[PDB]
Design a protein around this nucleic acid. Sequence first.
RNA 1: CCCGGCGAGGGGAGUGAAAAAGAACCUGAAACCGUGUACGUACAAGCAGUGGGAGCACGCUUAGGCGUGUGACUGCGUACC
RNA 2: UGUAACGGGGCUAAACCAUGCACCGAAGCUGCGGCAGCGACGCUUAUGCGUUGUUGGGUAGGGGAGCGUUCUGUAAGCCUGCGAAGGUGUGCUGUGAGGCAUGCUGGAGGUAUCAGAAGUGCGAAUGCUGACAUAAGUAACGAUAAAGCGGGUGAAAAGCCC
Lengths: 109, 117, 150, 48, 54, 103, 141
Amino acid sequence: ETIAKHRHARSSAQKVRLVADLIRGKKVSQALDILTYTNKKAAVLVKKVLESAIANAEHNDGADIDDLKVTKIFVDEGPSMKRIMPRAKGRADRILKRTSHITVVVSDR
Amino acid sequence: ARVKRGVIARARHKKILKQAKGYYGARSRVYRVAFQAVIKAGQYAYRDRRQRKRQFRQLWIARINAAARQNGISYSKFINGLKKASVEIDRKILADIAVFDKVAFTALVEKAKAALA
Amino acid sequence: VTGSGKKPWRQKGTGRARSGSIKSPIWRSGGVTFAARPQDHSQKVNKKMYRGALKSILSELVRQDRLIVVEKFSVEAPKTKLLAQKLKDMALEDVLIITGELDENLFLAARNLHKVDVRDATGIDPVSLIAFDKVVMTADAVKQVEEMLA
Amino acid sequence: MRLNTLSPAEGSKKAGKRLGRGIGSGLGKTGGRGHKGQKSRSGGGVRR
Amino acid sequence: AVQQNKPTRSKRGMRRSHDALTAVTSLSVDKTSGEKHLRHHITADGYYRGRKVI
Amino acid sequence: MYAVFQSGGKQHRVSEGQTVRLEKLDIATGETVEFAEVLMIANGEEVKIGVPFVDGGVIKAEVVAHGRGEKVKIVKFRRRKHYRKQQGHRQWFTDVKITGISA
Amino acid sequence: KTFTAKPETVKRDWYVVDATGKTLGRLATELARRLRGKHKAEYTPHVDTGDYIIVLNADKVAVTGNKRTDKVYYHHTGHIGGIKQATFEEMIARRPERVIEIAVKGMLPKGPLGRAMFRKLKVYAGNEHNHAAQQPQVLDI
RNA sequence: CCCGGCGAGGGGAGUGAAAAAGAACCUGAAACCGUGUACGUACAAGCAGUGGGAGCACGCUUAGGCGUGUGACUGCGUACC
RNA sequence: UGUAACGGGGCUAAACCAUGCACCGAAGCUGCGGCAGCGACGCUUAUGCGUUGUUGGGUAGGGGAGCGUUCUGUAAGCCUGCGAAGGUGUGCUGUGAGGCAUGCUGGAGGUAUCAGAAGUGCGAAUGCUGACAUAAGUAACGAUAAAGCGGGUGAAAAGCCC
Ligand SMILES: [Mg+2]
Ligand SMILES: [Mg+2]
Ligand SMILES: [Mg+2]
Ligand SMILES: [Mg+2]
Ligand SMILES: [Mg+2]
Ligand SMILES: [Mg+2]
Ligand SMILES: [Mg+2]
Ligand SMILES: [Mg+2]
Ligand SMILES: [Mg+2]
Ligand SMILES: [Mg+2]
Ligand SMILES: [Mg+2]
Ligand SMILES: [Mg+2]
Ligand SMILES: [Mg+2]
Ligand SMILES: [Mg+2]
Ligand SMILES: [Mg+2]
Ligand SMILES: [Mg+2]
Ligand SMILES: [Mg+2]
Ligand SMILES: [Mg+2]
Ligand SMILES: [Mg+2]
Ligand SMILES: [Mg+2]
Ligand SMILES: [Mg+2]
Ligand SMILES: [Mg+2]
Ligand SMILES: [Mg+2]
Ligand SMILES: [Mg+2]
Ligand SMILES: [Mg+2]
Ligand SMILES: [Mg+2]
Ligand SMILES: [Mg+2]
Ligand SMILES: [Mg+2]
Ligand SMILES: [Mg+2]
Ligand SMILES: [Mg+2]
Ligand SMILES: [Mg+2]
Ligand SMILES: [Mg+2]
Ligand SMILES: [Mg+2]
Ligand SMILES: [Mg+2]
Ligand SMILES: [Mg+2]
Ligand SMILES: [Mg+2]
Ligand SMILES: [Mg+2]
Ligand SMILES: [Mg+2]
Ligand SMILES: [Mg+2]
Ligand SMILES: [Mg+2]
Ligand SMILES: [Mg+2]
Ligand SMILES: [Mg+2]
Ligand SMILES: [Mg+2]
Ligand SMILES: [Mg+2]
Ligand SMILES: [Mg+2]
Ligand SMILES: [Mg+2]
Ligand SMILES: [Mg+2]
Ligand SMILES: [Mg+2]
Ligand SMILES: [Mg+2]
Ligand SMILES: [Mg+2]
Ligand SMILES: [Mg+2]
């Protein structure tokens, strides 16, 4: 219920799951403070989508705040911008600017 | 003219994947390793049929020997007595009788001993 | 193929396959190994074989009763309605017509009909004689066909 | 007797030999040429 | 020094198992402000052990 | 009680009312089959062992149905010898039900 | 259909044997047979249907010939020079319980099932045990 | 209309037969990467399969027992050209 | 390199030379069911309706019979918005390449039977193009001339301004 998505972000598909896996099944109140006190960049990106989901649940479905719980969350891979990194002896190294699609689902229960 | 081979190849590879369902690693995900696995499975079963026959034969023989030794006779002596009494019961049914109906096996060993000695 | 006859890379040293021309069929946007050329598929049939085939076709049409003979078949005006009604009263919908003399009115009437075709005795064809459900032939065309075949 | 009911004779229309189009057809990778010989090369054939 | 056979997703996951994250065990609450801050650190307003420093 | 008979080179032990799978018999789908080549009958401590068959042991069965067995795939392959072969098989079977057993 | 053995419904009994005056090669074979369950009609290759066997007076085992001085027991620790060598009398004097175990483990199949079978041998070095609660039955070789 | 940097992006409303047709836009497979459910796995050695096969979960059960998925254990078995 | 010249356990026979009776032991032989070829014989052929005997490991290679795709004629025919082609699953079936039915997505073409022509079937050629993994969240983040602090804007500043 009341999904929230962030697509074509600027991050990796492996560095966001590390902070995404520690809020599975948790309440929104704990999930927000954990994200605030987490020292990773992905914490801000996850907190933004969590706040968007909470606001959408409160404004569209009339749900409460204390009853919410993060029942589902997953991040999938996205398009990878291809760039070249200069290397010695006239070589080239294809570097891939990773992206991510973060999805959060918060249910009333 | 200009025949494309997309759907035919896709179906031919999906059939191989369906046959290779339940394998570990690339054997159940790609076609290059799956084909080497499904072929290796037919070759294994073509021999494992006879292997199953032999294994069941030697398991029935082992059970018959165990029951005969429990009753007080050897497997070779029991078989020789059965052949001298000219019965035609086989190893599978003999083992099943030894497992379930033990007094029937006792009667069989008595019949074998009577004809042997 | 429009291109250049130059090796993309030297024979050895590089850790890739051998390249001698970019127009190779193995590569992309290259040539064709056995590219086709404009050819004539017209076969050869003996005159006697063709005549025998025509005789067999006519004899089988006679046995199948899909060939009929009328002494006079013509239309008084170059209009399709008259021909359509004439075929309707004779119960013909998919029919070929053979005439000794080409009739302009009949040809104009049959031009706009898909399952109707008017032909001279000289311009007959076995494919049409087989395909058309019914065939109509006048005496002035039967005699010409007999003289052509015999 | 129609175009959908017409067939040729028997033994006249032979299929044809295809080389390098399978393993079960009998004409496998080699295609009736052998193994590494002058007779088994593209354009490799002795004259008369 | 390079690999000779491609590793597997199972081995990759086994290696990454220890690369997980540990969350905060618990938070601290100020006596008078009632906020939630880290242990032995100050709040976002300037409170620490009830006193004001900013 | 149970009895032991043979039909098709193999031997089968069966009790009253049970269904048995056998080889393809030239019988209909509702007829009755009599087996007289019985080998043993046991009915609770009264056993009778034939030499090689019993004097009057008879098994009466009803041919419930016919059919074909489960599909079997046969693969032959020679390593680096350019030889592989595929085959399929389905064994015909006849399912019967043991209507009666008599000594 | 062929009958098979279920580990949950199978039953196992307790037997006690004294290894006094008998030979290793003619006792360990019987122990392996009764551990693998080849003496029962319910024998199955993949199920441990054997019986729990207790061995008493393992130091009194009798061996013929000059094996008491020529019967070596080689093993390797794992290091380059980690090779050790003992004899029958030294094994009896130091670890007498590890003279029946080696034979029975060698005779039993190698694998998890073989280790499970070996786990049932309560080999002691005296003429008394502490498994009287299981109500064992005396057995002759 | 709301979250969000007066953003990116997305959730609602609306048009449209269709919005997992929203401009990265018809159909959208495979390699690859993810979430959820069932089973197995921390005393166990090897082309990772095959034959036998306990147990577990689900849905029909004419309760019989079968099917699907998992596969403790066991015999055999050192990929393709 | 570590027992290491019975496979191992172990064996005073469970070793060897002599006698006999049993058993295990293969895709070898016998029993049941099924498929195909050659040849004999009466099928007055339906070219197959019963017999009977026999054969059927196979590289290079030869011969024979077939499956699948595009297009063309049959076809201004047939199916199809009451859901086509294609995609993804299930069941059934044939010795086989395959075929049939259908659930869902898909949203407009497809094509029976009989014949004809091929750019007609891919796992390899350090094959070509595009995409995505692995090593891996590892090295590295580019002269060891050096930075620290206080204010300002901003959602956020060690890197922007004073
Ligand atoms: Mg499995
Ligand atoms: Mg898969
Ligand atoms: Mg017998
Ligand atoms: Mg030049
Ligand atoms: Mg180009
Ligand atoms: Mg071109
Ligand atoms: Mg001419
Ligand atoms: Mg040709
Ligand atoms: Mg050949
Ligand atoms: Mg070659
Ligand atoms: Mg040579
Ligand atoms: Mg040659
Ligand atoms: Mg050349
Ligand atoms: Mg190598
Ligand atoms: Mg790590
Ligand atoms: Mg073994
Ligand atoms: Mg917007
Ligand atoms: Mg459209
Ligand atoms: Mg799309
Ligand atoms: Mg997919
Ligand atoms: Mg365990
Ligand atoms: Mg291992
Ligand atoms: Mg099985
Ligand atoms: Mg090949
Ligand atoms: Mg040494
Ligand atoms: Mg055999
Ligand atoms: Mg044979
Ligand atoms: Mg036969
Ligand atoms: Mg052959
Ligand atoms: Mg043969
Ligand atoms: Mg085309
Ligand atoms: Mg067409
Ligand atoms: Mg539909
Ligand atoms: Mg098409
Ligand atoms: Mg389809
Ligand atoms: Mg469809
Ligand atoms: Mg057509
Ligand atoms: Mg081609
Ligand atoms: Mg390919
Ligand atoms: Mg390479
Ligand atoms: Mg390649
Ligand atoms: Mg990585
Ligand atoms: Mg780092
Ligand atoms: Mg490393
Ligand atoms: Mg390091
Ligand atoms: Mg570093
Ligand atoms: Mg560095
Ligand atoms: Mg720098
Ligand atoms: Mg530096
Ligand atoms: Mg500053
Ligand atoms: Mg700086």
